[PDB]
Each structure stands twice: as structure tokens, then as C-alpha cells.
Design a protein around this ligand. Structure first.
Ligand SMILES: C/C(=C\COP(=O)(O)OP(=O)(O)O)CO
Length: 190
């Protein structure tokens, strides 16, 4: 099952994703090396910042993409809740209750309640993975509208969104809602 995944990684360019603290919801803590994020017990008290998510428990990478083919890997470990993918630069960061859907500028999938994998389509799409991933590969092909997710350990395909037509820069995006020991960690380029 790994053959195509290996071929795709050799084609797509490895992205060096560093988390941007100025975007992170106040309930989130970004590590000193900007490679991991954890949910805090209580929100931090920060001054006003137009980059920050006020409602979704989200953080972005520092760099966006407007063309090309890119790949990065996220260690999710045994964390029981997480959603990851990309989002448009112009998502509404200051508006309560926006649903994270492609129409609102998010292409994300992940895990909830320990064992329920979903793609964040409208309505949400339930997934069934034969094995729980510990590392997830995200593939972005801007020109073809491809945003794909793979189990990065055994190379199995997880989900690809309906072909998109991107018109805004895209950021890696990470969401965590629950308080638990395991953080979300970006794997660096070898
Ligand atoms: C409360 C919150 C996110 C949960 O949104 P939702 O409650 O709409 O559920 P989901 O289908 O997981 O997006 C803040 O990021």
C-alpha cells in the first residue's frame, strides 16, 4: 500500500511548517520551537491581534501557499481529538459559530471522541480507517485542487476532498478542542 504514497512524497515538495503564535486561539499553547501545539487549561491573556482566531481553537502555520505541490507530516500519536489540514488566508477569524467546511475556506479531517474519524465536509463525512494513524501526511496540489490525507506510517490513503478551485493563499491549520496529555507535533524535513 505504501508504493503510491512513496511516489507521491518524491514528487510533492516537503514543506517546513512552523506554527504562528499570533494566530493561535488563546486557549492554545505553541511550543518554543514552534513545532507543537497543546491546549491549555485556561486561556492566556493577550492583547488584541487581528491575526488571532477568536472562536475556533485553531492555529496556523507561518507561511501560506499560492501554487505548487507540497507535503507535510503531523504526529498525532494517541491524542483522542484533533483536526488538521489547510484553510484560506481570508477565513473569518473573528466571527462566532462559523462551520469549518470547504465553503467557509477549510479543508480539514481528523479524530473525535477517541475513535470517530471524519472529513469536515458539509455534512461531515464519516471515515473508517482499518488502523488508527499516528502520523498523518497532508498533500496539497494547488493547481489541481488536491488536498489529500494519508496514514504516513503505512502509506494508506485516508481522504481526498472533492476537487477544489483555490483562489486564496492556503495555510496549514490545526485544531484541538480537548485537554489531554499528547500534543500535536509537526515532523521536520529529514
Ligand atoms: C467548538 C469548536 C469547534 C467545533 O465545531 P462543531 O461543534 O461545529 O463540530 P465539528 O463538526 O467538529 O466542527 C471551536 O474550534
Amino acid at each position: 500500500g505504501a508504493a503510491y504514497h512513496e511516489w507521491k512524497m518524491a514528487l510533492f515538495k516537503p514543506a517546513d511548517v512552523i506554527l504562528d503564535p499570533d494566530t493561535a486561539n488563546a486557549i492554545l499553547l505553541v511550543s518554543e520551537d514552534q513545532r507543537s501545539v497543546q491546549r491549555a487549561e485556561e486561556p492566556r491573556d493577550l492583547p488584541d491581534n487581528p491575526e488571532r482566531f477568536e472562536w475556533h481553537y485553531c492555529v496556523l502555520g507561518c507561511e501560506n501557499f499560492t501554487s505548487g505541490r507540497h507535503y507535510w507530516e503531523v504526529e498525532v500519536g494517541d491524542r483522542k481529538e484533533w483536526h488538521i489540514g489547510v484553510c484560506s488566508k481570508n477565513v473569518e477569524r473573528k466571527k462566532g459559530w462559523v462551520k469549518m467546511t470547504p465553503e467557509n475556506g477549510y479543508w480539514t479531517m481528523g479524530l473525535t471522541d477517541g475513535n470517530k474519524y471524519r472529513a469536515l465536509t458539509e455534512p461531515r463525512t464519516n471515515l473508517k480507517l482499518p488502523e488508527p494513524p499516528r502520523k498523518v501526511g497532508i498533500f496539497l496540489d494547488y493547481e489541481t485542487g488536491e488536498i489529500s490525507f494519508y496514514n504516513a506510517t503505512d502509506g494508506s490513503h485516508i481522504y481526498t476532498f472533492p476537487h477544489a478551485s483555490f483562489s486564496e493563499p492556503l495555510y496549514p491549520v490545526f485544531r484541538i478542542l480537548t485537554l489531554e496529555p499528547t500534543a500535536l507535533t509537526i515532523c521536520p524535513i529529514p
